[PDB]
Amino acid sequence: SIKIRDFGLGSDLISLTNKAGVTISFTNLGARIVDWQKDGKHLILGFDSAKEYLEKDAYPGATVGPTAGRIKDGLVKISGKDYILNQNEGPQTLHGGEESIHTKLWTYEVTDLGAEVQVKFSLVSNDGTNGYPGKIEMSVTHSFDDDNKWKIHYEAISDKDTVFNPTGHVYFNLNGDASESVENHGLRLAASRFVPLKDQTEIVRGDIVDIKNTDLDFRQEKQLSNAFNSNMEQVQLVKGIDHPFLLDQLGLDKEQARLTLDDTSISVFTDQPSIVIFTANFGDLGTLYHEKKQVHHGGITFECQVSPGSEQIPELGDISLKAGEKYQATTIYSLHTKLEHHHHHH
Amino acid sequence: SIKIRDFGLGSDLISLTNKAGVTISFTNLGARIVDWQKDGKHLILGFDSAKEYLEKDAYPGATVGPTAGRIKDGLVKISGKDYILNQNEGPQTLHGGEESIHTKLWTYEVTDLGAEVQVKFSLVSNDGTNGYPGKIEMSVTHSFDDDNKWKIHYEAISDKDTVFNPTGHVYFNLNGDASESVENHGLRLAASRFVPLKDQTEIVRGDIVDIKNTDLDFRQEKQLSNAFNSNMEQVQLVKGIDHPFLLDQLGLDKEQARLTLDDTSISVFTDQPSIVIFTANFGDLGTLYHEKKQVHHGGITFECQVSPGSEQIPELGDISLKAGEKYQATTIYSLHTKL
Ligand SMILES: C[C@H]1O[C@@H](O)[C@H](O)[C@@H](O)[C@@H]1O
Numbered sequence A: 001s002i003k004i005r006d007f008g009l010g011s012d013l014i015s016l017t018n019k020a021g022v023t024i025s026f027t028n029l030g031a032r033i034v035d036w037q038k039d040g041k042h043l044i045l046g047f048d049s050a051k052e053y054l055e056k057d058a059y060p061g062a063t064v065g066p067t068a069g070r071i072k073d074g075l076v077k078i079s080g081k082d083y084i085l086n087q088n089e090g091p092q093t094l095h096g097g098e099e100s101i102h103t104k105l106w107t108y109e110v111t112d113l114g115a116e117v118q119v120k121f122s123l124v125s126n127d128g129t130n131g132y133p134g135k136i137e138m139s140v141t142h143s144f145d146d147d148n149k150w151k152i153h154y155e156a157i158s159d160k161d162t163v164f165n166p167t168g169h170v171y172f173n174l175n176g177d178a179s180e181s182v183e184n185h186g187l188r189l190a191a192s193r194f195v196p197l198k199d200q201t202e203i204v205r206g207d208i209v210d211i212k213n214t215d216l217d218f219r220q221e222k223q224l225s226n227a228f229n230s231n232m233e234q235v236q237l238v239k240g241i242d243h244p245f246l247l248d249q250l251g252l253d254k255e256q257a258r259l260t261l262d263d264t265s266i267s268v269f270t271d272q273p274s275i276v277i278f279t280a281n282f283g284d285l286g287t288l289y290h291e292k293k294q295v296h297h298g299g300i301t302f303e304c305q306v307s308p309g310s311e312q313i314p315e316l317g318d319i320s321l322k323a324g325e326k327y328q329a330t331t332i333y334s335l336h337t338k339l340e341h342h343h344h345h346h
Numbered sequence B: 001s002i003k004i005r006d007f008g009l010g011s012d013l014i015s016l017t018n019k020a021g022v023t024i025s026f027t028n029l030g031a032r033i034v035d036w037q038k039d040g041k042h043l044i045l046g047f048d049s050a051k052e053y054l055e056k057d058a059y060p061g062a063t064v065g066p067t068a069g070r071i072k073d074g075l076v077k078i079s080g081k082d083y084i085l086n087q088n089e090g091p092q093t094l095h096g097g098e099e100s101i102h103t104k105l106w107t108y109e110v111t112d113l114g115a116e117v118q119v120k121f122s123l124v125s126n127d128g129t130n131g132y133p134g135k136i137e138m139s140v141t142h143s144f145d146d147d148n149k150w151k152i153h154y155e156a157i158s159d160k161d162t163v164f165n166p167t168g169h170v171y172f173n174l175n176g177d178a179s180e181s182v183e184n185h186g187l188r189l190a191a192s193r194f195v196p197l198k199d200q201t202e203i204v205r206g207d208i209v210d211i212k213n214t215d216l217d218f219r220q221e222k223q224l225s226n227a228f229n230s231n232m233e234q235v236q237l238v239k240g241i242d243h244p245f246l247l248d249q250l251g252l253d254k255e256q257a258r259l260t261l262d263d264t265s266i267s268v269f270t271d272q273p274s275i276v277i278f279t280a281n282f283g284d285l286g287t288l289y290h291e292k293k294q295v296h297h298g299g300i301t302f303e304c305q306v307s308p309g310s311e312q313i314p315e316l317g318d319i320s321l322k323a324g325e326k327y328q329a330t331t332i333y334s335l336h337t338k339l
């Protein structure tokens, strides 16, 4: 079933319920996921109206871009040319600059395929917007099916050579309450290396480091508390995790990550090379979610994309997008029950 | 009464009905006027869904900008520096460039004041959008009252020196049908001068012309056919009217223009110095409105703004907007019925 209603300020809330009774909802404000519930329990973090997003935190669940992450000094090189993008974080360009895509009302159309329902959001980034050559015609399709798979498919075409590397900023919290730390969740992640940050400004350090056998090694499932309790320099620098993890094996076919809590698991699939993880290291900020004051470590992201810092570490990849070339990206979050035995206590 | 409904593609339709039974409707798609009707008759042109506007014509009733009109070669000088804006009509920049603010979904909030209802639309034009320095936080407030006054109030603030001169692109047609020419309407317009076009490119010619005692003199009410039948080269150039008229006296209190058809009349008030009039000179195009094929001369606009062409004719005024300065503009369309 499909339902639509005003969500505030002119945005709409599109709610889907699949045959299993699982419901998920999106808004055209930032082509964003707002909620995902199983049996009355929220699996992700979200607000109750559009204004909350604009007044509390505009990132949760959003589509962010055109480039996700930080670009040192907002400088990129496009076809031998240097371009400076909007710098909204000191001299850095963070998540595409100020008042970026996550803050706009996208147009959308809904396609009912029966076992699957797709919600295709569209937006055009005009040439020069925030310093980005364009125009860029973008589309983000969120779909949910009877198999409990929530899929995100990105498509884009530019009139000019530009850069493109968007992501989805959902935050999970299997506790269903932001005031409950995710340190009690089990995490499995197929990555042997990570990208350290230089310092508090959070630009990349310049090197790639092997994390096998460290408190950041999750190849084999472990509780998130292991990472949170770590005094490794990188953990201490950010007060949790806030780093790109390089996947060891690529392909949409492979389960790259799995987040578990008791009988529920979220599996992550993608065709991208890295997973940027941020564990809501907000300290005592306490942003209110459903009237619950969010705790430090009260959420975790799995931002699939080309790793940030390729400007400094070419080995990370290339986010350039050629004029007329079609960009595509696919990320999938699938929900399961009783995938494994996870009975722990915090 | 207020009624909000889905208008297509995620856009909304906000319909206001005053104490008089008059209904006016807007959409956040382009902070635009969709309909205006009395006793079941449409007074303006408009479509029945968001898709139509995107597929047929995106300008009708829209807020256009940041700069309304044509900019020769897309060139503007800002603080002594040349800036090239998006070019969407040949080398010209027309109505802010491609995929401009009229094709965006604006956020909005409705404020019910009883005798008056306001709908505030907001949009941020990012720095660099279509070549324009910014960012520019813009708001357009459309309001409707019990006195049948439809008012447009624009506000804007830019983080950097830029240019700004938006306008409302409603097309009136008192016949209430697109297949019927407005040649039968009477027009009065308090302007003794106009800005001639250079040629078919429609860029300004460079001069300011006195129109007193010509087919374009509407200082005294006259029928549109007059103009339409004129042999003035400027009329023949565009096959109608497609020009900036310079108001003789400025100020919001003065009725600057009046469009009449029988018992019905629309009065125009504004704090702007010029009124750009375009008479839908589309020829055989035949765009469909409510299933009715539009005819050449099937509509007429009153775009109040600073006249286009100031890039070449400085006397027309100046559209710059300095960082931190607050831009304001007001335009009112008043509906009257003879009794
Ligand atoms: C990946 C994350 O990095 C963090 O430092 C920012 O604060 C987040 O909003 C961001 O998305």
Ligand SMILES: C[C@H]1O[C@@H](O)[C@H](O)[C@@H](O)[C@@H]1O
Residues within 6 Å of the ligand: B059, B069, B202, B242, B276, B278
């Ligand atoms: C002033 C007018 O000039 C005309 O040529 C255009 O086609 C109109 O849409 C524009 O508003």
Ligand code: NA
Residues within 6 Å of the ligand: A010, A011, A012, B006, B007, B010, B011, B012
């Ligand atoms: Na809507």
